[PDB]
Amino acid sequence: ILQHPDGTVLKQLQPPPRGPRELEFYNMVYAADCFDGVLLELRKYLPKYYGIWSPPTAPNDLYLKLEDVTHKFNKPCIMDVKIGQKSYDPFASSEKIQQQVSKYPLMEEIGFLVLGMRVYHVHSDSYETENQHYGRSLTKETIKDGVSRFFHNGYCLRKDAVAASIQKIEKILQWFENQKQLNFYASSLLFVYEGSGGEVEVRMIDFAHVFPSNTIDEGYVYGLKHLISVLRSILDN
Ligand SMILES: O=c1c(O)c(-c2cc(O)c(O)c(O)c2)oc2cc(O)cc(O)c12
Secondary structure, eight states: OBOOSTTEEEEEOOSTTHHHHHHHHHHHHTOTTOOOHHHHHHGGGSOOEEEEEOOTTOTTSOEEEEEOTTTTOSSEEEEEEEESSOSSOTTOOHHHHHHHHHHOTTHHHHSEEEEEEEEEETTTTEEEEEOHHHHHTOOTTTHHHHHHGGGBOSSOBOHHHHHHHHHHHHHHHHHHHTOOSEEESSEEEEEEEEOOOOOEEEEEEOOTTEEEOSSOOHHHHHHHHHHHHHHHHHTTO
């Protein structure tokens, strides 16, 4: 993710087929002449999309120009959570399914995976980052405390940010409850709150594996609900 002139980010297209599919997804959702109510509502929950972008002298080098969802924050605390029971898509080979399940074999049970987090700590004026291996080490036994860490400034548990996150996720859940045209695999939610009350961004990102469907995205729904339940339990801390 690169920064660009302010308020936006450039996301480089992943290698094919992933990049082209993510391009296609944003193009579909933000089609000028789209009057599909499902897709118009979905725009609210994504970064605003400004189209394909390439450097002036490098048409080969393909990015998505996207809203910087952290732009309005002073000291943003950010968590990326992959959502769903399966992070492989409907046309994955046996090798690919195994490859994806082995990255985090608890995906079916938990329905989400923390990809990373960056948390501003007040006491030290510094950031604490967790990588891929943090969330992949979390179990049913440790997921609640694993998620809680995101809302720790090192003075208090930010239950205001936790409650706001639940309320924002609930809207996304409602959108999923009201559509049967897209299924999302290996897609994520980006949570942002202010680390420097109740002010949160939750946006959907990572759309290299979104496919046409004629069913409710049940794995996504499962994950969102479990994530809501975990966040809700954290409000009892
Ligand atoms: O707007 C975005 C953003 O700010 C970040 C981001 C992610 C991190 O993991 C950070 O540590 C950070 O500072 C920013 O990612 C994104 C990823 C997307 O696919 C789309 C986006 O629009 C953003």
